[PDB]
Paper text:
In [name], crenactin is encoded within the arcade cluster of genes, together with four arcadins, and has been proposed to be part of a cell-shape maintenance system.
In addition, we show that crenactin interacts with two of the arcadins, [name] and arcadin-2.
Author numbering:
A (entry chain A), B (entry chain A): -1 to 32, 71 to 113
The structure:
Amino acid sequence: SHMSLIRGVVVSKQLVYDPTGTKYVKIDVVEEKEKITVPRITLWLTEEEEEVFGDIDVGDVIEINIENGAITIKPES
Amino acid sequence: SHMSLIRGVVVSKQLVYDPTGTKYVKIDVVEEKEKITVPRITLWLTEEEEEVFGDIDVGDVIEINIENGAITIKPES
């Protein structure tokens, strides 16, 4: 039915550790408006989970699709 | 091919404003391990974008699916 599309940019990735000492990568995605950026999604992924997704590098453009009962985050086409 | 599934819980929603004075809701999703929680996704959505998704309330269980070139975030079944 309805759908919203957000163009995101990966501005930051940082290695962090929980109390288990399990490693995650904190990935910050912002939207550009006007020229400023607002945060839109921050993900914390293990190194495995990132491999599964594919490349998600700083400077990459990310599509965030919001529809009824689903948010999808994909690389740009 | 490969796929990773994360069970998330919405622990927090907070009203915030960018410099445009545009309203977003900051939504924090954590994973339970052991008993502790680690952050997994933080989303900033306008009130419209949230309507499109459906209900996303504090205490709700969220599935995060990671596959090649896509992360999907859906309500629990």
